[PDB]
Amino acid sequence: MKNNGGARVVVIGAGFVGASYVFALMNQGIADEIVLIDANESKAIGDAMDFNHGKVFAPKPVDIWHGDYDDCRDADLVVICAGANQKPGETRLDLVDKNIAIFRSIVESVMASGFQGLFLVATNPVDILTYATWKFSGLPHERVIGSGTILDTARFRFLLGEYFSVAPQNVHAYIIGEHGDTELPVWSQAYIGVMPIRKLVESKGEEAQKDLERIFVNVRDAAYQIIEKKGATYYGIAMGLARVTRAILHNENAILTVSAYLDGLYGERDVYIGVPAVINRNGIREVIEIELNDDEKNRFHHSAATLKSVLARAFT
Amino acid sequence: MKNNGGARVVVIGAGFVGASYVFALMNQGIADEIVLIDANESKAIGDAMDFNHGKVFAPKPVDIWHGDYDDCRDADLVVICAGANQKPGETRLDLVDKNIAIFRSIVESVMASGFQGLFLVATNPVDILTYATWKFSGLPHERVIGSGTILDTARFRFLLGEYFSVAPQNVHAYIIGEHGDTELPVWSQAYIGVMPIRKLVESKGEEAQKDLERIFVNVRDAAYQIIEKKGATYYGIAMGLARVTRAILHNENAILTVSAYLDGLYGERDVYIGVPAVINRNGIREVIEIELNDDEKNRFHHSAATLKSVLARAFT
Amino acid sequence: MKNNGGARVVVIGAGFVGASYVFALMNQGIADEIVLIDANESKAIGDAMDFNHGKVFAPKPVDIWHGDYDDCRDADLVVICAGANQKPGETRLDLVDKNIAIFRSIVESVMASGFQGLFLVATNPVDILTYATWKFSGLPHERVIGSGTILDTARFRFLLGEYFSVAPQNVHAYIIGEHGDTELPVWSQAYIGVMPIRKLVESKGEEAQKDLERIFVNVRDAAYQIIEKKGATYYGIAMGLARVTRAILHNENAILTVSAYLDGLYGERDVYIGVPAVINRNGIREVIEIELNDDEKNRFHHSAATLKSVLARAFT
Amino acid sequence: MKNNGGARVVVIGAGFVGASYVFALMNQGIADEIVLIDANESKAIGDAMDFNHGKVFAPKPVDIWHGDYDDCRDADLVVICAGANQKPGETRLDLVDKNIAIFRSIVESVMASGFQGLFLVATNPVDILTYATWKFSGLPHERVIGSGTILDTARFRFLLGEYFSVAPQNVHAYIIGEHGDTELPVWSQAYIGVMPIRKLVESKGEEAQKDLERIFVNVRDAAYQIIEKKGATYYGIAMGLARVTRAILHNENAILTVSAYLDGLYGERDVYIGVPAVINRNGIREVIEIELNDDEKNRFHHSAATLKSVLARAFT
């Protein structure tokens, strides 16, 4: 129901990421009901109108309306996009003090609501803030999901889809670790088809080679390059979130590189970090523990350590 | 062709209306090729990147990129969403001399591209600018479509879908004439299902009555209300642009309330104005001359009386 | 859930009508789980299989299987496309005896399954069996829905769209009453947009009149010409089915002309017949009482009369 | 254009597969114009109307009709589905002389249209009949595509997707060689994510081992479990055909395992067979030569060895 008995998705923090997220769902026709909750009520309000006015044309009927935390109680997924945005220069981590703060309230209000579905966090630092969402709430880590490396993984696929002129969609590779600076390309297990990548290049020596490194860097700095170009990013994320949201509402068991919490799986513990996980109706079915090279073993590990410390000194 | 062979939609003015628009094409999966052209290349470039990052998740494989007017030589439709934005407070039509000027260039360049597809105009005041576009392009008018009243109707429908509690989609009423303050709601020909509106409300005077004029006023007011709440309308128009587009791209013979040129049809000539028209792969097949009551017969000629002014005066 | 948590549709009779309707849900990505119960094992098996091998190409993850009646406890929809079909020569009603027999067990076998969702019937004669299905089910009549004249209406707009060269989707006309030879065209409430049909032809020559008239005959007789060419009809109906399926599963508030039960609504009572009705997540919200003309009230009434007699003469 | 201006696909042989295909495309929203040509018009006249009756509820406007060869002159794509179906006990190869004979005409007749698009061959033996169309068409072999191992592959991924409990859309494996008995699963290069199959099963040796070979057999034999349960297969092959069709029509640069010409690539020349290949607006871009263990190579050669004997004797 669009009228309380359907797929109700609640968006907390309706700015660029937020609202784009909503426009993608509407266009895509993914949820039944969509609630917008934002501090800037007005924003929540015009936006809502704005969506409803174009609805005569969406592919599927959906119920959009501006709400409150009580709308939570009944929603299936609480997607969080409120908070501070990295300005030019700043990293992801320069926000932790800022956001964790906001999360204490947000998360408290939705729990108080009587809520009980899953949580989809998108705010940066996505690995820091999903752990906190997991904490501040007390639900199983299995129902607190962060975008993680879904935006980064898709950029990879895009760039490599372009290098070899094949559908991104037929490009098989991941970026894991912190959705940020310590992220890493899992070259060791990257494929174009079923044909490994680090083997179609072995024929074009120290070109393929430099070329490949080049992509990764573009990958890794995407945000900064786009932040610099138009101030904030959000279409890349909107699609990423819209994609995760259907694995769930459609109980898909789609492998997705998202922010999963580990406790020994990658030889790391008590950290939320981007890793392959099977997503379904009930949140994370399980984290996939892919075979890494010593090289990867090492930077993944370097990344896990990085987050680790932030958490260390960053709780509440 | 994703590579110089299919539906090439070229967007000029990658600001809000523009990009939101491109966003919809992308999720609905409507064009094969999408090119962006904005005076502000930076903008246009972080948008093309931001777009592309999400497409491994897009419904349909699309080709988005930042181009230039030569990318027009090959396009089926060029949508204009560039130009100056009416600001808060109260200013629509005050965007004329302003916009006329900008049109003067864009057209030239595009026409210079060696373009021969359709123009889709969205800048304000949409009707004025449609004329200009047509004038400056010198393509037959049946190939210069304006968005005119396509948003104002989505809204009547939505508002009445709601009063009446039916899919907006089952609400059949129109808004024509100026896409601005002289617009009029065609009550004489407004249905719910196949049942006259003023007959459904028949039974409940100066109640349902007053509720009918209250809906319409919020129709007319819509932009000024959103603009004050979130500063600029853009999701509703994008869903709007998106619709027409499929009319064209799919040889649909859809009936939309667009900006069409008159030559005697509503007792008016030399005026691009909002009026139901059969759209299809070759532009407007014809203007549909509904019948109006004396009253609506009056507002219409009135609205038209108004636009003709502006043109009389801000052409030359 | 493809996994016991989604929208589940049980299909009883995987014949032409049955299986084609399943093929629709799947290419449209409409339900999460699709159960097929056919009195013919192999077949039901043959198809679940054949369905399955293609879904990798399906637009939406969908779980399809060959089930049984326990399957019905958790389904949201039970669609019945089982039993005997008219032969060249036969009419809808010659099937009554043959088929009421089959709904007793089926209707029983599901009610005992612990079933508590909505029924959508399509076996012919579609209005006798919608009545039989509500009775034998002892559910509120608003939860037992028959396809009725959805297909009839569909061929009208198709045809009317073609004559006037407008999108099927732009012709607004109904085919009410019986889903057989007594059905009638509400020519009094038909529009091409907001333009009364009998007023576009009001201008014409070589009987737009005659032509209009000829359409309906074509509508009326369509099964018969189609049966005579390819042996049975199933694609039209597969599309009406999936349409309703949508109104329901999406809590849509869609006005459809389905086989609904009247309790004094068209001056008729205790009968299942084609009439416009708002459809949503809880069965039928209400029957719409369009205003008929004297000729139409007349044929409506004679249609209802033909039905009651069979109800009256062939109850189980 | 729904009106001589878009992507026109022609279906020669509106049988089970021919017709299902059209059902796949219409629901999915892929062509603009679909022409049906059958030895037996009636069949064709029957489907056409059946189809048209339901189009008011198709997602996108499409135009169906029963035409003829001239409708091929303007055709983007000519999909051949006409000819004799393998009977139970009968092999793919007992059909050859039957089906060659028919292709000489059909082929010759479309050419003569002034046909100049691409050919997608479905009729069995697919590798043999695709070669035949190329032979008979005199067009460059990049324009004569057979469906070869696309279903065989739709099948392997669905079965493993189940064995492992991941979305089939997430199993990366192929079936190559003759669409028939000599086909082979490319085990040496199959993943479930980014992780090697014979690595996941590594841990439960000779259980995972046996499981995996059953699957394979189920795949190999699937044609016949179905021929025997329900008499003809047509739902998988139709989703498979729909998929190619979009690869082309969207100039997607997709990698599918199709029947393609070998001119050295797997150390085989002058044979048409199931091999991965990039597909776009111009048909086949290239054959993809993946890496094979000795075993795969051997069978693959062996398979080739077989097509090659049939052809030697099969010319017309």
Ligand SMILES: NC(=O)c1ccc[n+]([C@@H]2O[C@H](COP(=O)([O-])OP(=O)(O)OC[C@H]3O[C@@H](n4cnc5c(N)ncnc54)[C@H](O)[C@@H]3O)[C@@H](O)[C@H]2O)c1
């Ligand atoms: N993880 C990803 O891949 C990713 C990608 C892009 C952007 N982002 C994240 O998105 C976040 C902000 O995104 P943005 O650019 O859309 O910013 P934005 O300003 O557009 O949106 C933030 C919104 O949150 C609302 N908000 C603030 N405090 C609130 C509170 N206490 N309760 C409810 N709502 C509140 C504000 O009203 C504002 O509208 C950043 O943290 C950024 O890191 C994440």
Ligand SMILES: NC(=O)c1ccc[n+]([C@@H]2O[C@H](COP(=O)([O-])OP(=O)(O)OC[C@H]3O[C@@H](n4cnc5c(N)ncnc54)[C@H](O)[C@@H]3O)[C@@H](O)[C@H]2O)c1
């Ligand atoms: N037609 C409708 O119903 C409707 C609805 C809403 C808004 N609008 C109209 O949309 C128009 C623009 O919309 P917006 O709010 O997104 O404004 P915006 O400022 O955000 O975007 C307009 C863009 O045009 C660009 N531009 C200006 N001159 C250009 C040129 N010569 N070449 C290329 N790019 C150029 C600017 O850089 C800017 O990016 C306004 O004129 C507004 O009135 C129309």
Ligand SMILES: NC(=O)c1ccc[n+]([C@@H]2O[C@H](COP(=O)([O-])OP(=O)(O)OC[C@H]3O[C@@H](n4cnc5c(N)ncnc54)[C@H](O)[C@@H]3O)[C@@H](O)[C@H]2O)c1
């Ligand atoms: N309502 C409409 O517009 C409409 C349109 C077209 C056709 N039809 C109706 O659909 C009905 C059948 O259509 P069809 O062409 O698919 O017939 P069909 O023979 O091809 O299919 C009927 C199926 O029912 C199965 N069946 C028989 N007894 C059963 C039982 N007890 N439980 C489960 N399955 C059982 C058969 O084995 C077969 O699979 C006919 O009444 C026909 O009049 C209705």
Ligand SMILES: NC(=O)c1ccc[n+]([C@@H]2O[C@H](COP(=O)([O-])OP(=O)(O)OC[C@H]3O[C@@H](n4cnc5c(N)ncnc54)[C@H](O)[C@@H]3O)[C@@H](O)[C@H]2O)c1
């Ligand atoms: N490649 C695949 O994976 C695949 C899968 C399944 C079935 N099939 C192939 O499909 C073929 C037939 O399929 P079906 O089950 O739908 O058969 P069918 O008998 O239902 O359809 C075949 C059609 O061919 C028509 N036809 C015959 N000669 C013709 C001619 N000269 N010109 C035009 N039309 C002509 C017939 O009248 C009939 O309409 C078989 O040969 C089989 O090998 C292929």
Ligand SMILES: O=P(O)(O)OC[C@H]1O[C@](O)(COP(=O)(O)O)[C@@H](O)[C@@H]1O
């Ligand atoms: O590359 P293949 O094996 O042909 O498979 C393509 C399928 O894989 C996907 O790209 C998913 O890939 P990932 O496993 O990398 O998530 C789908 O989008 C697509 O349908």
Ligand SMILES: O=P(O)(O)OC[C@H]1O[C@](O)(COP(=O)(O)O)[C@@H](O)[C@@H]1O
């Ligand atoms: O003629 P209009 O007002 O543009 O109406 C089109 C709308 O009507 C519909 O065709 C439904 O029509 P009905 O009201 O006749 O059921 C929708 O599918 C479509 O969005």
